[PDB]
Design a protein around this ligand. Structure first.
Ligand SMILES: Nc1ncnc2c1ncn2[C@@H]1O[C@H](COP(=O)(O)OP(=O)(O)O)[C@@H](O)[C@H]1O
Ligand SMILES: Nc1ncnc2c1ncn2[C@@H]1O[C@H](COP(=O)(O)OP(=O)(O)O)[C@@H](O)[C@H]1O
Ligand SMILES: Nc1ncnc2c1ncn2[C@@H]1O[C@H](COP(=O)(O)OP(=O)(O)O)[C@@H](O)[C@H]1O
Ligand code: BEF
Ligand code: BEF
Ligand code: BEF
Ligand SMILES: [Mg+2]
Ligand SMILES: [Mg+2]
Lengths: 411, 405
RNA sequence: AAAAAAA
């Protein structure tokens, strides 16, 4: 008997279930929960915590993008102090219907904090105190199944490897292939790294891409399409980044696929208080501090776990603002996979700008010979043009299934 | 006895009935005297809900703006049938107090009012990539059909498509859009066709009104930017409402670049101006307007094909174009150099294109276009068109052209 | 003022 489970079940099964026990769907669930409480049986609910300024908080739900919801569960301050709860903590426990003069479900006892024992949460090392590090463990994207879509993943490993705690960017003009390459990444993460906690944050992007993502990726998808205002974009992004930090505090390897980070940066610039100083492109002088901390949240932890963030960025949009945003995030991140519109217009995919792509400290994510082979490959591709580089590399890789066999051919 | 029907009938046909009983005043007198008899009087229009809670049924004669013949709608009626701005309402009215009032509604969006309450709101409809295609080729062998045939090869269009006709001035965008309307009415009469002309030429609406088989809402450049916005808002809301009734709506906008400028001049100064003179918050609403087009899984769809300006010498139009390109999923570019050589359509094949075009084409058609894509790419834009025009001119239809390959 | 524009 769980709240969110009743919200997920179809109306047909809810009406039937209600008739057996003896109005809008929310009323069906509410009436069914009340009747189940009268029997004396226990009721359960869950959601991600958001502590208000007064000291108390609520358990936002994913069906509301972790925003204010009618079925939010009240969490008393005493409960927060007992287990040292903070914004982002996923909470599950027994709940009760609202009494006379109340408007929300109350939390009786917390059973699980971040998919773990509540006693383990009180004693922990905060995310702000975790010792950062460069990416150590390699997150190889290559399927190896010889798939035609795997070509993108294979070229990515050779151009810009990705590790746990990476802080990368898929930079390219509109219609270059950022989203689908991000989707290709999501597929390889679910297959090669089912141990990682996968999250897909969609900010100010196409609505049909939201449903396309949630029915394609094997993970959680939090979205806020361009039908939504900038105020919603920020708040939604804040909840997702904090939930990730909480899981990292439990030594979890979280991966956030953001699209787009340029849109998110514009949103912050829309809600930022005017400072009387504007940068080139119409960017507020204090607007990029928040997005820089959001992107900079991604990091590798020595104590355990990591936070990875692969976000897409826009360039050559005709607006100098997007040039400033991209360059500011490049001085913040440590990995960039560029995609060329010139290559994409020739229908050559993946339209990857090999020379401009790359990853920082890639020697910590590759073997000694793997790095030496990648080093030689770049020296050969560099003199080539953007289009010729991809047509050359794709034709060579298509001959073999894996990059390891491709390397064996080079000798 | 209908209100907007009396407004359509000539004054001569009006005076005939007016004298037997005993232009705006004589209509108001006929409706009033008819009400004295106890007989039913009728009226209609598109609803616009104000801030207080009540609304008015705007007339298509005033471009859905405020009108003396607008019908009053009480808040109880809006709540009764869960009406929202954009709903087409018809029913009995009453003589006024300086405004007619709706007695009871007979049809809500051309359907029983009770059925319009159990519907899902447009914001809750599940979006999707276009799966049903709107083949533009007529295959009649006409010279105008060439335009639609090249379009089917360069950038396919489907239900819920969100595309643009990008080109410099005098490249052939409007005449392209007119060719669109002709194919929409001839190939897909089932679709609700609308043509929204914003800040454009006055002779192009009169030419459109007679050319296209549908509705034409206009707002020439003789009108302020504030009017352009309000007119567009009304049209896009009416489209959303029809999509809520599972209708395949198609809006041919011209121009959306003019619409984006209108918003840019209306939006309050934010203290931040993007490159080209575009306010930092000026393009939000235009994005939601153009981004209204989408394919619905529950049924119906909204397709928007708008023209866009480039190479205007103004960086502003370059920012708007790139912004809409990152919002839509289809573009059909037109070259000024091809148009100056009298080569029509002046389509820039390599620049044009449609996203997820595999969901709109058969596997054979996709491969044919893929090969033809690689062959045309090395050619110059002028040499590309003159090459494709000749090959397509040899045949009446694209299917037989695919057979030559 | 900055942004924009200009360069
Ligand atoms: N002397 C060097 N030898 C090898 N690689 C270097 C050297 N200097 C910089 N790099 C490369 O540059 C990356 C880091 O650049 P960084 O010093 O952060 O530049 P910046 O400080 O200008 O951002 C590393 O991943 C490294 O591979
Ligand atoms: N398919 C066509 N066939 C012949 N002439 C055309 C065609 N398309 C455009 N034109 C020429 O272009 C002129 C109008 O261009 P227009 O459609 O207004 O371009 P834009 O809308 O980009 O300003 C007409 O005078 C016409 O001669
Ligand atoms: N790996 C790929 N294989 C084939 N087509 C691709 C690939 N990546 C992108 N595309 C093409 O790009 C279009 C979508 O581009 P998108 O990913 O939205 O770029 P962006 O996100 O930069 O706007 C699709 O229609 C698709 O045909
Ligand atoms: F149009 Be892409 F999503 F930048
Ligand atoms: F990214 Be570098 F540190 F400027
Ligand atoms: F002059 Be065109 F209508 F852009
Ligand atoms: Mg994208
Ligand atoms: Mg025109």
């Amino acid at each position: 008997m769980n709240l969110t489970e009743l919200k997920n079940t179809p109306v047909s099964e809810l009406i039937t279930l209600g008739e057996n026990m003896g109005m809008r769907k929310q009323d069906i669930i509410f009436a069914i929960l009340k009747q189940h409480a009268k029997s004396g049986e226990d009721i359960f609910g869950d959601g991600v915590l958001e502590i208000l300024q007064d000291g108390f908080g609520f358990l936002r739900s994913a069906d509301s993008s972790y925003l204010a919801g009618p079925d939010d569960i009240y969490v008393s301050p005493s409960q927060i102090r007992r287990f040292n709860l903070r914004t982002g903590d996923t909470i599950s426990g027994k709940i009760r219907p609202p009494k006379e003069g109340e408007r929300y479900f109350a939390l009786l006892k917390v059973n699980e904090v971040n998919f773990d024992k509540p006693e383990n949460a009180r004693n922990k090392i905060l995310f702000e105190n975790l010792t950062p590090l460069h990416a150590n463990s390699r997150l190889r994207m290559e399927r190896g199944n010889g798939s035609t879509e795997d070509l993108t993943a294979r070229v990515l490993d050779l151009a810009s490897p990705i590790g746990r705690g990476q802080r990368g960017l898929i930079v390219a003009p509109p219609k270059a292939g950022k989203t689908m390459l991000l989707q290709n990444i999501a597929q390889s993460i679910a297959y090669n790294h089912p141990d990682c906690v996968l999250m897909v944050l969609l900010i100010d992007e196409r609505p049909e891409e939201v449903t396309e993502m949630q029915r394609l990726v094997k993970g959680e998808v939090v979205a806020s399409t361009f039908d939504e205002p900038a105020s919603r974009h920020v708040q939604v992004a804040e909840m997702v980044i904090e939930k990730a930090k909480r899981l990292v505090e439990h030594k979890k390897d979280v991966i956030i696929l953001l699209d787009s980070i340029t849109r998110l940066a514009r949103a912050y610039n829309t809600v930022v208080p005017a400072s009387g100083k504007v940068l080139t492109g119409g960017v507020d002088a204090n607007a990029l501090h928040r997005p820089k901390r959001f992107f900079g949240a991604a990091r590798n932890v020595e104590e355990g776990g990591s936070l990875t963030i692969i976000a897409t960025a826009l360039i050559d949009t005709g607006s100098k603002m997007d040039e400033v945003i991209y360059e500011e995030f490049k001085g913040t991140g440590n990995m960039e996979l560029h995609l060329s519109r010139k290559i994409a217009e020739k229908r050559v995919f993946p339209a990857i700008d090999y020379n401009r792509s790359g990853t920082r400290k890639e020697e910590l994510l590759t073997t000694q010979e793997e790095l030496q082979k990648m080093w030689i490959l770049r020296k050969i591709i560099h003199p080539m043009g953007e289009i010729d580089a991809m047509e050359f590399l794709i034709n060579k890789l298509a001959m073999t299934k894996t990059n390891d066999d491709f390397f064996e051919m080079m000798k």
